[PDB]
DNA sequence: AAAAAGACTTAGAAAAATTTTT
DNA sequence: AAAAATTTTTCTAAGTCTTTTT
């Protein structure tokens, strides 16, 4: 059981009518280091204050990671650690390199190993304590039901792990108290703050979806506590997301033949945005918001391209005209491509590239803000991200219908599905030998069992009784079980091998549901509980003849 | 119109949990 | 009977997009 797609449209603007919960689970108080776990600075044994010893542990735990080998990290870490230090220590500890965490490191490594092998009997209780935490704070009451909360556990204090070349990595993540926690609820039983505390602010805003919010010290940005992907306040928007990408599917031809004329505009921004959009569409390039310089890791999207991320080569690789992309994309993923394009864009690109130093914005007089405004102008609620959802649902849908072999069995049909998924990861780009010794092992185990039926075949030929035919048939199914078993490992092998370098985000699930249904493939084999619990609506309201 | 704050979605990377190899 | 290997779950950083306001 669960709503809700069989439900009556909540209007825009209203998120909920009733909202009540039990607040966020804070990080358990810091347990001070045991006596025989010491920290020496310069070989000199030291016992740090609890606030300083806390931070020390953070580094002690990552004393086996690449992060702690990098300057930016170590530079930011110490400075912040210096702040959590009493005048006593402050004066003494002047540099990080002189500190010795190796003992504290070994300790938590022991702790981890110790918790790796505890009495199974007790393990159940940590799964129990966990479960009770789930039962008590993991759920909430929105409107008329008990929807699950996603990240009900507050963010523990640690060391900010900046992906890529982040000038902030290593900085101290403060322990968030209730005095920082903002609460959202409706007529609801306000959750009491931990004995002796007070919330930052208890507000009732039904124009947003979050339950708890606080500002993080590292970037100031606000962190939210939201509901499970299975919830309606999330599903409603997910079902709507793909529908918007389906709305686009219609007028895509109009929009395509539209921005193709916008290349001839008597205005820069228009002539510019048209080229930008051409990329977002053709290469599933992300919008590309303007980042803070020196406050974040420097990456770029489509709008935020600089002239140094591209190069134009009239003739290259023999065709024609080529645009060489080279830049770091999202989670510092380096995007590098030479893309043969139309002449109009080539000529248009060079125009945006006269009298400018590499450090200048390629698409100036242009930003995501404008580009998206122009988008919700043509089609309702249309944005840049939508284009990727369309491009690679459509592509998946087409891939299976041309990969899936109608007459094959389940495991072989399952691989057809996975194979399509790999092909989908081509436009967006990407996201043994112990096996063969069990494959080849059972490969003979099959022929040496097909041999039983071989000799049992000659039995019935001249002994045409009946109980003999029962033995012949009992080896037939025995060979089939090995025929089955084999194909499962033969599939796994080529599958695992195929994979070298969207499933959770850009793919309309309904596409899969319709495929799974028409080819009689149980959804359990394609989706785990995480997946079908969230894709509940699509698993339900999708006939075998659904097309994007 | 423009920018900064605020809200919401995407996703990589780790941690737990599960099956499977030694 | 750990250990090694996959495959789910949790986590939270990194984007997009919207709302709010200078």
Domains of chain A: residue spans and CATH: 1-30+119-229 (2.170.11.10), 31-118 (1.10.10.41), 230-384 (3.90.15.10), 385-548 (1.10.132.10)
Instruction: Please give the protein residue whose CA is closest to the C1' of the nucleotide B16.
Output: A127
Q: Is the dihedral of CA A430, A433, A434, A440 positive or negative?
A: positive
Q: Please report, for chain A, how many H helices and E strands are present, in that order.
A: 17, 15
Measure, in angstroms, how far nucleotide C12 C1' is from residue A528 CA.
22
Q: Which residue has the tokens 């099959």?
A: A446
Query: Quick check: A124 CB within 7 A of strand B?
Result: no
Nearest nt to the CA of A291 via C1' is C15
Query: Quick check: A383 CB within 7 A of strand B?
Result: no
C-alpha radius of gyration, chain A, whole number? 30
Experimental method: X-ray
Q: Which residue has the tokens 């849908």?
A: A397
CA-CA distances (angstroms) from residue A70 to A66, A161, A167, A173, A368?
A: 7, 12, 11, 18, 34
Q: What is the largest CA-CA distance in chain A?
A: 100
> Which residues, other chains included, contact A346 with Cβ-Cβ below 8 Å and sequence gap of 6+?
A312, A314, A321, A323
The helix (run of H) or strand (run of E) holding residue A142 is strand A139-142
Whether A387 contacts A394, CB under 8 Å = no
Instruction: Please give the protein residue whose CA is closest to the C1' of the nucleotide B10.
Output: A505
Burial class (CB in 10 A: 0-12, 13-18, 19+), A407: exposed
Query: What count of other Cβ atoms lies within 10 Å of the Cβ of residue A389?
Result: 22
For A415, how many CA atoms within 13 A lie in the half-sphere containing its CB?
18
Q: Which residues from 290-329 of A have any strand B atom under 7 Å from their CB? A: none
Instruction: Please give the protein residue whose CA is closest to the C1' of the nucleotide B6.
Output: A222
Query: What count of other Cβ atoms lies within 10 Å of the Cβ of residue A186?
Result: 16
Reading across the β-sheet that carries A139-142, which strands appear in turn?
A19-20, A139-142, A145-148
Measure, in angstroms, how far nucleotide B21 C1' is from residue A436 CA.
14
- Across A450-466, b (16+ Cβ under 10 Å) vs e yields eeebeebeeebeeeeee
Q: What angle separates helix A343-351 from helix A268-282, to the nearest 10 degrees?
A: 130
Nearest nt to the CA of A489 via C1' is B20
**Positions on chain C within 7 A of a protein C-beta:** 2, 5-20
> Which residues, other chains included, contact A276 with Cβ-Cβ below 8 Å and sequence gap of 6+?
A302, A303, A363, A366, A371
Instruction: Please give the protein residue whose CA is closest to the C1' of the nucleotide B3.
Output: A369
Query: Token digits for A134?
Result: 């789930």
CA-CA distances (angstroms) from residue A427 to A244, A389, A421, A424, A453?
A: 20, 12, 11, 6, 49
- The SS3 assignment for A224 reads strand
CA distance A176 to A222: 12
Query: Token digits for A487?
Result: 């194909």
Does the bond joining A320 to the residue before it have cis omega, within 30 degrees of 0? yes
For A101, how many CA atoms within 13 A lie in the half-sphere containing its CB?
19
- Beta strand spans in A149-254 (E): 158-159, 172-173, 182-184, 201-203, 212-215, 222-225
Query: Token digits for A107?
Result: 């300790």
Query: Quick check: A4 CB within 7 A of strand B?
Result: no
Helical spans, DSSP H, in A384-507: 386-401, 410-424, 436-447, 450-462, 467-498
Query: Quick check: A205 CB within 7 A of strand B?
Result: yes
CA distance A433 to A336: 33
| Residue A132: φ, ψ to 5° | -65, -35
């Amino acid at each position: 059981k669960w709503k809700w797609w069989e439900e009556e449209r909540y209007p825009e603007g209203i998120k909920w009518k009733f909202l009540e919960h039990k607040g966020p689970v804070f990080a358990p108080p810091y347990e001070p280091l045991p006596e025989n776990v010491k920290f020496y600075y310069d070989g000199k044994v030291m016992k740090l204050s609890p606030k300083a010893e806390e931070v020390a542990t953070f580094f002690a735990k990552m004393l086996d990671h690449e992060y702690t080998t990098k300057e930016i990290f170590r530079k930011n870490f110490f400075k912040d650690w210096r702040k959590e230090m009493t005048n006593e220590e402050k004066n003494i500890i002047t540099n990080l390199s002189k500190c010795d965490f190796t003992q504290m490191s070994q300790y938590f490594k022991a702790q981890t190993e110790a918790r790796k092998q505890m009495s199974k009997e007790e393990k159940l209780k940590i799964k129990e304590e966990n479960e009770k935490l789930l039962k008590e704070y993991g759920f909430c009451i929105m409107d008329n039901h008990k929807e699950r909360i996603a990240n009900f556990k507050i963010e523990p204090p640690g060391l900010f792990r900046g992906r890529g070349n982040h000038p902030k990595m290593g900085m101290l993540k403060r322990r968030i108290m209730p005095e920082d926690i903002i609460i959202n609820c409706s007529d609801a039983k306000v959750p009491s703050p931990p004995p002796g505390h007070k919330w930052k602010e208890v507000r009732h805003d039904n124009k947003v979806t979050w339950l708890v919010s606080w500002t993080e010290n590292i970037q100031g940005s606000i962190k939210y506590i939201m509901l499970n992907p299975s919830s309606r306040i999330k599903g409603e928007k997910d079902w709507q997301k793909y529908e918007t990408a389906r709305r686009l599917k219609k007028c895509v031809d109009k929009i395509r033949n539209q921005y193709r004329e916008d290349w001839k505009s008597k205005e820069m921004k228009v002539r510019q945005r048209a080229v930008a959009l051409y990329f977002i569409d053709k290469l599933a390039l992300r919008a590309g918001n303007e980042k803070e310089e020196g406050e974040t890791a420097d990456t770029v999207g489509c709008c935020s391209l600089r002239v140094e991320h591209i190069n134009l080569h009239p003739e290259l690789d023999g065709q024609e005209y080529v645009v060489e992309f080279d830049f770091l994309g999202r989670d510092s993923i380096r995007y590098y491509n030479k893309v043969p394009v139309e002449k109009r864009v080539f000529k248009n690109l060079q125009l945006f590239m006269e009298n400018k130093q590499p450090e200048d914005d390629l698409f100036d007089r242009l930003n995501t803000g404008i580009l998206n405004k122009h988008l919700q102008d043509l089609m309702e609620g249309l944005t840049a991200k939508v284009f990727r959802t369309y491009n690679a649902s459509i592509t998946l849908q087409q891939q299976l219908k041309e990969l899936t072999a109608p007459d094959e069995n389940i495991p072989a049909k399952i691989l057809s599905y996975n194979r399509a998924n790999r092909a989908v990861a081509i436009l967006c780009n990407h996201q043994m030998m112990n096996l063969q010794t069990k494959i080849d092992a059972k490969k003979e185990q099959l022929a040496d069992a097909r041999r039983d039926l071989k000799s049992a075949k000659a039995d019935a030929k001249v002994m045409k009784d009946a109980k003999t035919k029962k033995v012949v048939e009992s080896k037939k199914k025995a060979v089939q079980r090995l025929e089955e078993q084999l194909m499962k490992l033969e599939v796994q092998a080529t599958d695992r091998e195929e994979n070298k370098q969207s499933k959770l985000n850009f793919l309309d699930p309904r596409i899969t549901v319709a495929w799974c249904k028409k080819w009689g493939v149980p959804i359990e084999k394609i989706y785990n509980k995480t997946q079908r619990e969230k894709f509940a609506w699509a698993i339900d309201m999708a006939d075998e003849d659904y097309e994007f």
